[PDB]
Design a protein around this ligand. Structure first.
Ligand SMILES: Nc1ccc(NCc2cccnc2)c(C(=O)O)c1
Ligand SMILES: *[C@@H]1O[C@H](CO)[C@@H](O)[C@H](O)[C@H]1NC(C)=O
Length: 346
């Protein structure tokens, strides 16, 4: 169990003005820290944010959060469940800003909701430095789905924050799970929703990427293959080749089981395009499966690419940041259809 702490600075809030927070389990014999960003879409105007507040309120408010959470997957402290980082200090940061962790805007007489995702991450880091993070050697910023995209948007800002605070010895790294999307043509859109969202949230993107695409085009930096080459911190990319949320935004629904030629070609092309975008990503894990998220699911140890599991690949990554014989870090499936890899989740 990780224990809830609400932020001491109560001006850093969830959507409805309630304090943001984090869940923490310390490991006093370790100098490694894992900060995980929760996912789950986003909302981009008053009407669809109001709907989210009715039936997804834990993603907009801390009023009903429980006092504890069990750590699972990469957040588990049992070596049987987490071969990679079982002895690390564990942090779970709930997603209550609905802004893909990009926002920097308070609730006011002009704003019904606060969108403070980018500021929530910075305040969590600040308050953790007083609880042992000041002694860390590695800070791994991880996340799934919208939290995976949030890693890409925030990892270099965390590194700059710690540099300016006088901690040049902490190595900041990123782990982005299921947050590497394509702005592709639909089978029958995220780019327009994100564009409107950034204006509604006062959203912020990494500075080098912002300077490339410039004013009005910041939405480009929410797409992994465009923002990743601008980042300085090491980032490991975990991405199913046939991600269920990618297929949803593409208006694809695999149902009833009889795929005709047009849909077959569409799905095969999506796999090939996302393989292409990862070809020059040296730390990556991309299996040919139809699924969504992996790193905090308990059976995350089961899937393999070319005979190597994800916990093994992450360990090999750690070794590379001290090629390695028999301990690979770039693992991308080549077969072209979902579940052509036998280790895919059932
Ligand atoms: N259905 C669905 C679709 C997208 C998701 N990610 C947000 C996102 C979308 C596009 C670009 N970047 C981030 C999620 C989730 O967070 O679980 C669920
Ligand atoms: C609280 O957070 C806000 C928003 O980031 C910041 O402007 C303010 O300085 C913080 N207060 C303290 C005491 O750090």
């Amino acid at each position: 169990d990780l224990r809830l702490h609400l932020l001491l600075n109560t001006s850093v809030t969830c959507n409805d003005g309630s304090p943001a927070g984090y869940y923490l389990k310390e490991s006093r014999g370790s100098r490694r820290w894992l900060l995980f960003l929760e996912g789950g879409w986003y909302c981009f105007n008053r009407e669809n944010c109001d709907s989210r507040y009715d039936t997804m309120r834990r993603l907009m408010s801390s009023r009903d959060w429980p006092r504890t959470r069990t750590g699972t997957g990469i957040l588990s402290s049992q070596p049987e469940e987490n071969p990679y980082w079982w002895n690390a200090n564990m942090v779970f940061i709930p997603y209550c800003s609905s802004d893909v962790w990009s926002g920097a805007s308070s609730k006011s007489e002009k704003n019904e909701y606060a969108f403070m995702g980018a500021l929530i991450i910075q305040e969590v880091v600040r308050e953790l430095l007083g609880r042992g993070l000041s002694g860390a050697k590695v800070l791994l910023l991880a996340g799934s789905s919208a939290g995976g995209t949030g890693v890409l948007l925030n990892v270099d800002r965390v590194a700059e924050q710690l540099e300016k605070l006088g901690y040049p010895a902490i190595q900041v790294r990123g782990l982005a799970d299921s947050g590497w999307f394509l702005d592709n043509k639909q089978y029958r859109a995220p780019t327009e929703a994100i564009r409107r969202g950034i204006r509604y949230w006062n959203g912020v993107v990494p500075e080098r990427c912002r300077r490339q695409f410039q004013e009005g085009e910041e939405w480009n930096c929410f797409f992994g293959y465009k923002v990743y080459p601008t980042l300085r911190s090491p980032v490991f990319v975990v991405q199913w080749l046939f991600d269920e949320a990618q297929l949803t935004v593409d208006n694809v629904h695999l149902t009833g089981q009889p795929v005709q030629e047009g849909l077959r070609l569409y799905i095969q092309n999506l796999g090939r395009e996302l393989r292409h975008t990862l070809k020059d990503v040296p730390a990556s894990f991309a299996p040919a499966c139809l699924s969504h998220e992996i790193i905090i699911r308990s059976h995350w140890t089961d899937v393999q690419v070319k005979g190597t599991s994800l916990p093994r690949a992450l360990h090999c990554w750690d070794r590379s940041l001290h090629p390695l014989k028999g301990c690979p870090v770039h693992l991308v499936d080549s077969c072209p259809w979902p579940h052509c890899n036998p280790s895919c989740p059932t």
